[PDB]
Amino acid sequence: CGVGFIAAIDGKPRRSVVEKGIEALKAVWHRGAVDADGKTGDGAGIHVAVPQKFFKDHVKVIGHRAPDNKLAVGQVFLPRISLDAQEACRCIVETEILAFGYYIYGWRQVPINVDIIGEKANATRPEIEQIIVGNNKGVSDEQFELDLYIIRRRIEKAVKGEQINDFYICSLSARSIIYKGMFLAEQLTTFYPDLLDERFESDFAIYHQRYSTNTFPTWPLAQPFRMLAHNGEINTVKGNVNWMKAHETRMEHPAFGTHMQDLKPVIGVGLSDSGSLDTVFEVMVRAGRTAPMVKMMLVPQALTSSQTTPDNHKALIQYCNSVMEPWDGPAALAMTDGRWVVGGMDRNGLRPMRYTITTDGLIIGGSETGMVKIDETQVIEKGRLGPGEMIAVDLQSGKLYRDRELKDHLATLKPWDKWVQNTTHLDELVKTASLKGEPSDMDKAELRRRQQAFGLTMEDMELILHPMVEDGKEAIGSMGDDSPIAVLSDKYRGLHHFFRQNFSQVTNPPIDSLRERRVMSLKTRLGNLGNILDEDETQTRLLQLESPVLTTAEFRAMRDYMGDTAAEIDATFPVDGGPEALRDALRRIRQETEDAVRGGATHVILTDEAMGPARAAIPAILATGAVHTHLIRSNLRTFTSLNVRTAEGLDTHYFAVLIGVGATTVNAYLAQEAIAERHRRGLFGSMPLEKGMANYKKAIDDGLLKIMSKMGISVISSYRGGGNFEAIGLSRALVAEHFPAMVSRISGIGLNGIQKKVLEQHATAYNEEVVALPVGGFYRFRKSGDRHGWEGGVIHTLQQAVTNDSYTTFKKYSEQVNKRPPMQLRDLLELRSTKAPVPVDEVESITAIRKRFITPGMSMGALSPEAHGTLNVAMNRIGAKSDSGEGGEDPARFRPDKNGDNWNSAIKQVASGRFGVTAEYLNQCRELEIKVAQGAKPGEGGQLPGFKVTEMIARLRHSTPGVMLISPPPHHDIYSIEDLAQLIYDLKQINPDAKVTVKLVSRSGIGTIAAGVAKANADIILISGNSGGTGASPQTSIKFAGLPWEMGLSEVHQVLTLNRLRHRVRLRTDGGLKTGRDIVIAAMLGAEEFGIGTASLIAMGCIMVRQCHSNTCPVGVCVQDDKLRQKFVGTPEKVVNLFTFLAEEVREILAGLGFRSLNEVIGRTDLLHQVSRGAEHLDDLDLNPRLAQVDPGENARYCTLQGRNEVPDTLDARIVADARPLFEEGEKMQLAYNARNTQRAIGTRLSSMVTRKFGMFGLQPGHITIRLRGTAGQSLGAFAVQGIKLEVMGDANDYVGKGLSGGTIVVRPTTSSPLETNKNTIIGNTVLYGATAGKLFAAGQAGERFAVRNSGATVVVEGCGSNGCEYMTGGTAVILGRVGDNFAAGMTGGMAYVYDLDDSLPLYINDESVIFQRIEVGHYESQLKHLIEEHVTETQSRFAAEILNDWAREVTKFWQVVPKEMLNRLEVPVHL
Amino acid sequence: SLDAQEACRCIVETEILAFGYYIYGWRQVPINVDIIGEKANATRPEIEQIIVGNNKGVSDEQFELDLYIIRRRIEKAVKGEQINDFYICSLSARSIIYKGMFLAEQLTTFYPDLLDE
Amino acid sequence: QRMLGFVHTAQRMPDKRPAAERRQDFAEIYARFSDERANEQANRCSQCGVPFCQVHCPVSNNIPDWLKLTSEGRLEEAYEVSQATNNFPEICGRICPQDRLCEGNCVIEQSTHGAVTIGSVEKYINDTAWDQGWVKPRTPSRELGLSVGVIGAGPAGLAAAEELRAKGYEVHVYDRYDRMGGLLVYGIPGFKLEKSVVERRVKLLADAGVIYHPNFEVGRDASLPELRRKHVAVLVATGVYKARDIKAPGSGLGNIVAALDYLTTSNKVSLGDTVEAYENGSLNAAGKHVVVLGGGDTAMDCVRTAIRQGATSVKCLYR
């Protein structure tokens, strides 16, 4: 994977550009996916300029006369199987080109070499040809390009008319050409030998290679595209296509003319995200703008509210943000207009981009700093690209614009200042809105009768609403979800329960909303859409809101401002209408809306205040969805807005789905009425009503940001109307008709069931006297409320059976479990074989089955030490595996005790926080595990309350005792699938024996991701369910996130069997397993190993108190207190008996069916049938999508290989061959080698050998030293231990010093380089991620997110970037230069010194948890002095030497940054 | 692709239910792939059946006419969104068609349903 | 405050009167909580999911809900929630054996931290509602034109009567004794259950609109077909009164009395009526040696009411 570009600055063609482009493509084979075939690739492409001399010579040879003006060439992919569709395509192309009047010279067959393509990329290979078109009309060049663009668009439309397949036009221009295909990266100049000619010379070049997630290549999907090249992924593609459909109905420009009609569906069908973004980019460029302006408009910068940028740029970005919705996602872009050549980044800066300027007037940018070979004595400046930055080259003038210079040159075209001031705000109107006209609050009886009509219980106001008004933050739950799914219940579950939220797996990282909050906006605009192809003042005249949610006073003020332009629509249907009253009401409202919009109205208010004893209220979700979809399909949405007044919104999940469906603003008045009525009774204490409303709105805003952040979307504008949810339990027809773009894998209730539920609840509310709301059980069990998976009798029976060791009692327990009405998806399935029963004593032995169960990870922060030790003792006794979870483990238990117990854990986890990951913690296991997402809370980090962190856990995690620890939602290491492959390579290098497990969460589209991670050499996939327990997490994330594991597992199995990849990995599942029937069902679906989890805790004494977070669990399971931990009653015999009973039940079932092994039943789907609940529920659930049986072929239906998937050997092997006297005698050594950027994990296997031999601290510092010269690759010296010293002369790419554990790394420029050390980037991104001890001295500027999750390391660098020292927990760090924005975000341990000259640190720092001062104590000056002296000694810098020379006057320039939590814990206080 | 299947199913279900008939469900036809060659297997489609019942009590000729119109409109719709490899071998309450790209004598082996009594 | 105080408090029931003082009188032995101590003892509950305190309560009261609404003042809403699902909450809190139904199963009892005093808090938050006029009769809104009859004035009879009258019907009770209330007024003694709250609840029922038929035997003064023809439906709640016996050498001697008649005479004398079996008869135990047979709470009440009236030596024989 990788994108890059090369450009001659002066703008003159030369062969060296293409030569270096090919050389750079020849050296990216290590980031791609290898194959056992060796010939199969997954895409490659290059994009260069047209060599006029070549084609003019060809035309001369044919017999024509070479024209004077530039010649045009187009490359086409025609069908290959049928020799008639080729002629039809040729006829179409020729009759369309000759329609404008241009002259066709002829066709040419591109010479190729097919002997190097694989077997699958060759069966779908198209026929490649070129067409030569000359400009005989003498028209200009820009008009020539415009005509060629229009010709290509109309040709595409025409060939799509007659339904001809396998036709593509890779490029059609007179300036540039594209050579791309589905071959290997290094085999490009072999498949296309034309590039070996001496006449292919250009002044720019772009190159790209991708990393696919499936194994069915399609040639028209490889990059680069026409005028773009993208590396990464776009989050909002289902949300941007809709707004593009809405914008298409008004855009026009006088350049195209009548042919504008042939450009209406600008985004075709069957493209990828990088194809859609490219199409819109090109249609915006061809209309007059230039590449920098289009990049600024499509992918903007972070509109920070700071004074570090001039307000000229602020006005510019304001206009660009007001004109168009952003296109989010991790993205490195390398685009090229006809004139400019631009390289840019996204808002967050997740992908890397590094460039280099030479003295030959050459700029080279890419993903790595060692792709092309350049001598050090000829470079001028090395650099990087921050978040939102860009660098451009102007070829027509021959100039190089860096970031700020390009911004200044771009901010001089139009007077944006006089245009932006046309906007108006709302808080001003709320202030000028006189405090009169406050209506009367509804009576208690009316309030109760309106609340009963929606099913609101008394716990909905005493558990999840009181915290919002009281503190301003959502609630916290402490256990998994055990409630029935929405469609299988019998009470009234609102329509907002059928929609589960989404998140992002390894293919996409989430965003931290607690620290990186400065790049997330909740702005709203009314009266915004217009023609996006002009430049005027009417585009910046609108109403602007700072939040989509509104109170009642703000809504009344907005209504008064709107006046007679809005239209109020009723949303009620008659209760006595009939069996189809809801459908008629939907049709009525969706016709009245269209009738009112055409009549000049520009605001649609969807009010349902008319709910009475004879009119039921339509669910707001369905109504707003119908209205928005109808306005989209009728070319009217761009005219008006859509404001909703709902009477059901109480929590942050309702507003989320209302805004995701398409509503603009949402006002919830019933919640405000309840708040006022609870305040007038004197329940909140002494706070005024305004304080309650402010806290409630703040809680709603933070909840919206948290929900929107689980996906990677950082702006509300590009998230609205995109449908980022999943419908479970709804009909396919209803979903496909009323909702824009959502998937409903299994069907559900239609409109009749919804009408029945609504009418029944409304009758219950309005036909009987209500005296008080029902108590209600949804989060806690109550006799009146719903049913639960864990009830009293079940728990007591299980505990008695496990304690007394009686199989009959456990069978009674399993019967009680399997006799309740259906509550999950696996309850509607039934086992039915056709063989004859076999005697029970013939099936596999109980041991051979117990060795298939494991216990999932439960961190030592959540559990007590005794419970963790008990589980680990029990599992290591029967032969199966256990898990330690995050939070590390105690090293003293790394040995069997005197009695014979083994308190260790056979599976170590690698969480997001890297909480205890060291070099010895990884060499004491048999299987590693990469936790991407948890079952309960997906796309979010695990939490740990403050008081739960005692001194023991503080020492165990290397943190501060008594402070809340929240892991970051992303990994900062896994930003794409190639990053996951790199991390797997690192983990397989540090431990030469373990197997790498990847943990996922079931959802829609998990099959492609699982097929992707299977190519990354992982051998175990884990599919967690939506019902998994947890130690602490919010309620909205527990109840409304995830999917049942039956969908994810059954999809992953099918997708892996389809790609011939199932026979290499093992599948594992967990979440909601209680009896053996569920185990057999999961084995039938495809799983092979099983995780138990919560049931284990119930065998040891847990009684589902659900108070784990409050640190007062009675039985003492999840507590850190002493007097409660004295109440532990656990015993390993209990867990052993539980596992024994569970295995015996599976033996019984297998004997009853007629098989003799779990191998004979894995994958055999035909033994499962679906039975309906009856003829009174009428739910149309069809489970056939999960019962589909793909035929495997000649391979088996499970893993049939031993050992791990091996990886290619790195440089370390050679080192192990040489440093033999170190391992045989223990003597100092000294080695020197040559480093290259295609050599990953330099010095990790040696670290494993040293850790196994001497230990982490057995050798003196600097026992073995290695000297490398050149550009080191990725993960330089990951997980190195004390005694290893790597010294690099040159620069390292990425992840340098990851997981350092006492080693030493020194990076310095070469001796023969004319470069200032403090003005050139030397290391890359994510430096010292989660290190625990050691040193690192660099002699340049670091990259992005410098020293994240540092715990014990001491680093000295001469610069930094954005988000430096993010969430640092311990150690010291000196920075001799400028820093980036959001410095020291979430820092909670350690100390920092910054050498700041221009007095600008108060403008960049995030003064939330840290304080910055001047150095005042000599005890702290001696530390800095010694640190800088050691830096000068090691790296031999000149800037640091200059600082040390003038010490007395430069000591007064340093800023000392100290956390707030370490102000009363330091020995020597920092103050006087 | 496991997504175009869902789009096709959505189209079929939203078009059949547009007239008012009652859908009983889908069924996966049991087959035996071990007898097809190498080229007739690389382009093999997924074979399924849909069961539709006449709840409106309409006559049989009108039932056949409605089924014909439904099939025509489904074909037009699925051709609208440019989805490939979709076909409706038959849709009626009178007759059914079992066809494929196997050998002539291997028919009752690929489709074992015809071995039923 | 956040009610998770089972960690830094200790269970303590309300104040009990010493043994040297209980033997004399016939009043109760416990006392109502003080507000400062009830507000603290109700703060101990853990507000646990899957509340075992509710699973094992035959009426299934929402114990955590009013246990919470008590710890924050707001006693009116707590009384409302408690009364919404149990007709006689004070009688229940006074006599329900809690060591096997409610105080014997909640999560902090299995953990040997001591159990929440549920019955005493029930008594507290239900008796303090009388002291402020919060209790009101449940008169039917719209008078319905039907009549229902019930046989018996015990707990089941009174509960069914209150529910039927709240529905809107018209009810007629039929009791054998002269004072209605079942063996709550004649069987259970005066130290366990005070005879004032019983008549208070019965007077509230009478105010609701029920009709009382005292001194009316269903066997003598009427017949089942007659009452069947009178109303639309009749509810047999006559209870159980045929006592067991023992046949052994000497089972025909004098001063061998049954327990129910003894308890009835004791309750009558505690009310008055100067029954002659107390003055000159074997139903007094002033200075005699008493021995009771059989076990259970019946024998407990008998032995206690015997040791109350002097009874120099009393013994109990259980098998």
Ligand SMILES: Cc1cc2nc3c(=O)[nH]c(=O)nc-3n(C[C@H](O)[C@H](O)[C@H](O)COP(=O)(O)OP(=O)(O)OC[C@H]3O[C@@H](n4cnc5c(N)ncnc54)[C@H](O)[C@@H]3O)c2cc1C
């Ligand atoms: C803490 C506690 C203590 C207890 N103590 C005792 C005790 O000391 N003694 C004891 O016996 N039980 C005792 N019990 C038993 C318990 O009270 C009973 O289970 C409960 O009272 C049953 O009441 P009931 O609905 O049967 O009505 P009962 O209380 O049995 O009253 C039934 C009513 O029907 C009337 N009746 C009876 N026959 C006729 C008829 N032929 N015609 C008309 N009316 C008729 C009776 O006079 C009475 O009014 C005790 C229970 C508890 C929990």
Ligand SMILES: Cc1cc2nc3c(=O)[nH]c(=O)nc-3n(C[C@H](O)[C@H](O)[C@H](O)COP(=O)(O)O)c2cc1C
């Ligand atoms: C108290 C507790 C702590 C947990 N900690 C972790 C954890 O640290 N990492 C993790 O991946 N899963 C964690 N889990 C989830 C379990 O690993 C597992 O996915 C879940 O318990 C399965 O749910 P089940 O027991 O109902 O089958 C935790 C679960 C609980 C209840």
Ligand code: SF4
């Ligand atoms: S009574 Fe017991 S089970 Fe019920 S809430 Fe209190 S502690 Fe929990």
Ligand code: SF4
């Ligand atoms: S004391 Fe009250 S709450 Fe407890 S079991 Fe008896 S009636 Fe139920």
Ligand code: F3S
């Ligand atoms: S659910 Fe949690 S609060 Fe205690 S009783 Fe079990 S560990």
